[model samples]
Target: GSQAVVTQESALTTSPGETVTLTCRSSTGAVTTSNYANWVQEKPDHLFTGLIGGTNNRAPGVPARFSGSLIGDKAALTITGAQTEDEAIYFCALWYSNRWVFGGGTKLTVLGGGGGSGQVQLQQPGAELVKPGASVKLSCKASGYTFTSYWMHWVKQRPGRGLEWIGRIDPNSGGTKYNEKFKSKATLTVDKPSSTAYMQLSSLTSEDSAVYYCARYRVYYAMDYWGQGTSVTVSS
Candidate 1:
């Protein structure tokens, strides 16, 4: 309907100890699918992975045991164990129309592995928010990795709630773009000179009380990378 082009779906099937890759893209935009893109795993009974931004970074509460990575324009989601429960539809989504546009979903058939660690380490700690109408910038510093090599994105998380990906900023070029949903609600900016990313929410409110994060993107549109995540609270 819109001028947006939907890309083809790529799937992989493998046995235990073997790794498989699930990839997706948009037809008109960059192969990476833009900042609003995500990966979701759906099990029977309406249960599913909320949304895995890009391909690799798991959302909060997701088993750290699973891993996601982005190679070039392709975003890949990999599950080490082929657990039967893991055998469900894996869908790719893009952010448009203020909501998530999901892929058809790939059914993953996990054949093995039942026990593993579920510890998730925060890549970025929460930060304090600046006063209302004042510009506030928070950062998720990268450790054990090169900071300048990828694009970092900003996301929002409400307490005891799901995730909201605001937009992304290119670290190499200091360029930024926002989801139309956040056009007036927020602004995404970057400081390549400081190696830190920024998300400034104008006219704050209780609605703005949530965890804000900085993440990395493997490609132009896909959020294959992520930062620890920072929470911003607005107050009078």
Candidate 2:
């Protein structure tokens, strides 16, 4: 299975007092009611607001108009009577394996009442073909966004397999959390001077032949942006 995340709309526009629904679809399979659908909003000035959780439970202080639900194979977020202040980026997240996968986000433009708005690019090194027992340090360079505001998370995808979370590092504080499975084999670090995050893999083996992705971690295990992935091939 490949990475499971997608948002059907790149940009959506609405007028004041109108209604709009943003959809979040998954490539893995159809969305179900058993899944927990989370919706987050980003207004101006890098402010992120958690709008809904558990597919219809609005967060405290969120306006009543905002709602979430499973709408026929895909998760949906409906904004009833949208206002100018509601114009922002809306992102939906669904649980995938050990972490939450996020959509590309919908840039909502609300006219009449006045509202205007606007992932980030991650650059990692190219393919690495190495020998067994050797160690490799992979670098993830971030740009087009504030690198310090979010944590850098790493994911591993074996050939023809699904994604597994490796670990994450806070670029500003160097704080890290690793999955128990990866703690012994992976070391995470950050270089503030270069705006880059690095993960060093120890004891490389054929099992490590996979595409590794570096992602921008949003709140609550949500990865909002991801790199093109670095290919690591363990060989003789």
Candidate 3:
């Protein structure tokens, strides 16, 4: 495996209904169609949603205001008629064989409207250790909001790779959904009274070592609140 370095605009601001373009570049080489640039939006408290991928393809239900394209050597995400709700951090990602690399992220602020919202508090243990073939359960506790009013989700980021969607759970209904790739790898559960969500990863191995994040799904796959992250290690 090798390291991939991607760069992006650190910050940008614009008034509602204006246009803004954020760029992402690869220091290793020119970003081309083969790179399959992916863009994700992160709201305060780490709320994240898939925006654009494959250079220009918008995710299901994504607004027409958001689009992606290749401009010269860099890839770009352009928001036309931006709304105040669009204010958030945008992170660009590039797929590299079996792994993905992400840019540092750009903080985009759409001026006007209700612009100052505070972050929700989420807590997670710092780290966990497990041996090969063992299993581990990670926990995420939520505060500052009605935990049952939102869904809980899990994501995995390998040591040097981008994020991978693991799955999510409906805290209110006790229903769970998993990304096909992680269906057999993760189990999602929750404790309503405690306002906590738990994800147990099974069949551990070196490949499973990663930083796991617990996030809250606002609606329609938009994540709003996120835990700091829990580092899990699988060793001998």
Candidate 4:
């Protein structure tokens, strides 16, 4: 597959309440409506979120402050009501056929204050290797506020592909939920002893090789805040 390079011009800094519009141009060719333009925000830490997708839409439960649109030969992600928390790395991704590719990402900085409160942090493994048909355990440690006030979720991102919802768990009570697709293949667990959530997937094959992520689910089904992804490979 050919790579798509996305660029954001103009200053990437702005003050509170101002509208900030970031543009992205795909290098392989024109970014047409047929292409699904996906955008992600990488916060401090390896925390990441899928902000907007498709022709011009925000993920469900996300606020109106974020939006995506196809602009002629290019694509764009527009952020209204600039907030300090909005200062982070932005990447443009495109979904074509069976694969998805991401941009190198641009860092956006908010010039002022007040929006720096309540941080949610996550930690996961760098990579993992396992034999085919074997099982493995992945951990996600969360901190920086209430230990389990929010739901900790696990999602999968295959190489050059969009994210797939694996499952989630309520840290406080240990109630669990899954994508059904992962119901029998994966297990969601918790370790309140260290405020960490976990996912254990079994019978893995090459199909299971991917970058697994843990996130605190916000609003409805939106992985607004995230942990650094864990790349798991099922080999030999």
Candidate 5:
């Protein structure tokens, strides 16, 4: 499998209350409902929100104005009442090979900062526990929605770097997939007993000095409902 990447428009503009649509395309194949059609919003301040998922379900606390769905061969996110504050970058992601991939994201100009929103928050249960062994168990918890209703993923972000998906597991089935890139390094698991998704990193090295995240999963690399991330400082 190749590295997953996302594609989106350069920019879009809308007036207050006007409808605006954002579309995302996948590099591997035709975008489908199987892609999960997930959408995320990022504010200038760096706050992130899951607006829609599963091809169209609004995330918890997500206003009715925002939607995730299909647009022919592409996945889409829509805002019905565009406001100045609604102006932000919308990123679309999907689940491919247990990994999450995101689009370049689109900039939305609301014409006026008419304040409006949808928000999501995450929690990592562990501090970057110092490691001395070959493997370690870590976790992330979700809020604002039915935790088990959706799928979850484990992603790795090198400090001051980019997002890398290690693997993902379905809370409902416990079925999981691990990336070949981390074939000897990463594992994805869950604690259904406690409503948490976990990642176990092995062969720790200085390169693993990064932030790890637990996010809700969808097809085509849509990793929604992302947690704040857990840090791991592996030192000898």
Candidate 6:
């Protein structure tokens, strides 16, 4: 079993030119929460990446508007120059229950600006669980990059929605780690010998349905890397 810990209860609030910090925690020790933790900005049309991993760090090519940090087991996300267009729900996430569990989204209200409402861009195409006993292997071929330097992680995404950290596979070492919530429900394994990854769930049910994706950790323990995603339908 795993639990989520938040260091501070008070929501950090700020204006267009100010900065705010939000914190998270896990009492059952690091577990998968540390490596799976993710920061998301929910706009009207999409969900953008703010931070991931245990500490406050930005993803590659991301703008300077977002940042994060970690003190001991406490994790924090800080956003600077909050814009009117930045008004939307902000949330932290981890993989759980064969899906992504999101923190109660933080609603951001813009005080000023003519066109402040933003867009909500969900991660991308998701997968549905094939019926129980049915074997489905989704793959993400590494293109325009080297695959050996980093670990490949898989996440689940509901259609047009947020993210759920499923599990991660070390392509080079063939080591696997999963959210305790998924212990018996899902199986994660990789054939680094084949340069491919796989996730197989048995006795699939309606609830065992979601989009599966292959990703990588730009920084160790941080889910800064992502794959295009593959959707698996569970129906027999």
Judged by TM-score, which candidate is best?
A: 5
> For residues 63-177, could you state the per-residue lDDT of candidate 4 as single tens digits?
6788878877878888778888888888776644434455656778898675522365788989999999999999988887676777776778774444566766888878886
- For residue 142, what is the lDDT in candidate 5? 63
User: Which candidate do you rate higher for lDDT, 3 or 6?
Assistant: 3
Report every candidate's CA lDDT.
Answer: 0.58, 0.76, 0.80, 0.74, 0.72, 0.57
What lDDT is obtained when candidate 2 is compared to the true structure?
0.76
Tens digits of lDDT, candidate 3, 17-50 = 7879999998778999878887888777545567
lDDT of 6 by residue, 1-236 (tens): 44543223324445776666666555445424334566655566433444455444556655576676664565556666676766766666654433345555566665655332242111323544466666555656554445556766666666545455666666676677776656666676665444555677666666556666666565434555455556666675
Best-to-worst order by TM-score is: 5, 6, 3, 4, 2, 1
Q: Residue 5 in candidate 3 has what lDDT?
A: 80
Q: Write the per-residue lDDT of candidate 5 for residues 172-199, one digit (tens) a residue.
A: 8878777777877877777776777777
**Global Cα lDDT for candidate 3:** 0.80
Cα lDDT for residue 27, candidate 3: 79
- Residue 120's lDDT within candidate 4 is 59
By lDDT: ranked, best first: 3, 2, 4, 5, 1, 6
- Ten residues in sequence with the least summed lDDT for candidate 2: 113-122
TM per candidate: 0.53, 0.55, 0.58, 0.57, 0.73, 0.66
Backbone clashes, candidate 2: 0
Give candidate 5's whole-model lDDT: 0.72
**Residue 154's lDDT in candidate 5:** 73
**For residue 89, what is the lDDT in candidate 3?**
85
Over 4 Å off, model 6: 1-15, 25-38, 41-50, 70-74, 84-89, 93-102, 114-129, 157-164, 189-196, 219-221
